[PDB]
Amino acid sequence: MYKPVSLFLFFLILAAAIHTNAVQSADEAISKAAVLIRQPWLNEVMTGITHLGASSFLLPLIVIIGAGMFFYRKTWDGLLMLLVFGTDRLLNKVLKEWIERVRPDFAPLVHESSFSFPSGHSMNAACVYPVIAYFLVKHLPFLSKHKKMVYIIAGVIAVLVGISRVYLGVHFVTDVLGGFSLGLLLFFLVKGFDEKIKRFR
Ligand SMILES: CCCCCCCC/C=C\CCCCCCCC(=O)OC[C@H](O)CO
Ligand SMILES: CCCCCCCC/C=C\CCCCCCCC(=O)OC[C@H](O)CO
Ligand SMILES: CCCCCCCC/C=C\CCCCCCCC(=O)OC[C@H](O)CO
Ligand SMILES: CCCCCCCC/C=C\CCCCCCCC(=O)OC[C@H](O)CO
């Protein structure tokens, strides 16, 4: 359907475009321009923000939220959340090792030990936070009438995580957009599935 196909097509176009010198040059220019806004206090804040996208943070977060939902509503939907997360990490790893993009390496503020495209923190955040939002709104009746705000929070968090990877000099903008599009794709897939299997609307 429209939204996951558009994101998939957007990723393919980006995966091709990063091989053009025009995009590589714009990616370099934006990466270096981000250094100009840096301050040490903001370096610290952005490092804290970026941890919200770390798989070492999101795995215990998903397990905690899923456990909470199990006690509160007896749902096993936390297993769906773990599955889409694992799918997300597997897909990011396979694409990274296939594409083998070199990292910016102008001015990194955090450590990395892998290829650059697509960004795993951005892919993690664009998948997990909208997914969490979906299942929280599904299972927490006190979040009804706050649904738009829950999803806005998930979107703000994911965007900030992506911004932080460019700020911290470890991803190019296109790495972030590539990870955004595929994490969001996985979100729409698991949301569409969960809604499709409902026996009452
Ligand atoms: C959701 C839309 C429908 C489905 C998705 C298909 C269309 C995606 C839209 C724009 C892709 C832009 C990609 C961003 C990278 C820019 C690519 C580019 O402009 O390349 C210029 C070329 O390199 C000069 O030599
Ligand atoms: C127009 C809307 C539909 C778009 C559908 C297709 C658009 C993207 C094309 C192929 C995707 C696969 C990308 C694979 C990467 C190709 C570039 C590449 O591999 O370059 C390597 C070569 O060694 C250079 O040195
Ligand atoms: C009603 C029950 C369902 C809702 C669930 C209620 C709680 C969910 C809300 C906040 C969780 C905050 C948890 C903070 C995340 C901890 C992640 C962690 O442990 O971090 C590991 C560290 O990063 C290693 O590198
Ligand atoms: C109607 C749509 C049909 C789709 C319906 C399901 C919704 C999609 C969600 C998850 C896919 C499940 C695939 C499970 C693959 C798990 C892979 C895994 O856990 O690997 C961990 C990772 O490799 C550590 O590095």
CA distances from 56 to 10, 60, 62, 85, 126 (A): 28, 7, 11, 12, 16
**DSSP string over 186-200:** HHHHHHHHHHHT-S-
| Cα distance between residue 10 and residue 108, in whole Å | 27
The residues, ordered by sequence, that sit 6+ positions from 32 with a Cβ below 8 Å of its Cβ are: 106, 107
* CA dihedral sign of residues 50, 157, 180, 61: positive
Q: Output DSSP code: residue 134.
A: H
Residues 6+ apart with CB under 8 A from 144: 137
Cβ atoms 11, 122 nearer than 8 A: no
Q: Which atom of ligand 4 is nearest to the CA of 90?
A: 23
How far are the Cα atoms of 14, 97, 130, 147 from residue 57, in angstroms, in the given order?
Answer: 28, 23, 16, 24
Residue with tokens 């999101």: 58
Nearest ligand to the C-alpha atom of residue 52: 3
Handedness of CA 117, 121, 127, 130 (dihedral sign): negative
Solved with: X-ray
Angle at 151 between CA 186 and CA 43, to 5 degrees: 85
Q: Which of 1, 11, 13, 182 to mutate to test the pocket of ligand 1 (most atoms within 8 A of CB)?
A: 13
In Å, what resolution does this model reach?
A: 1.8
Neighbours of 53 (CB within 10 A): 27
Distance 110 CA to ligand 1 centre (A): 29
CA distances (Å), 60 to each of 63, 123, 154, 187, 191, in order?
5, 17, 17, 19, 21
Give the chain's end-to-end CA distance (angstroms, integer). 20
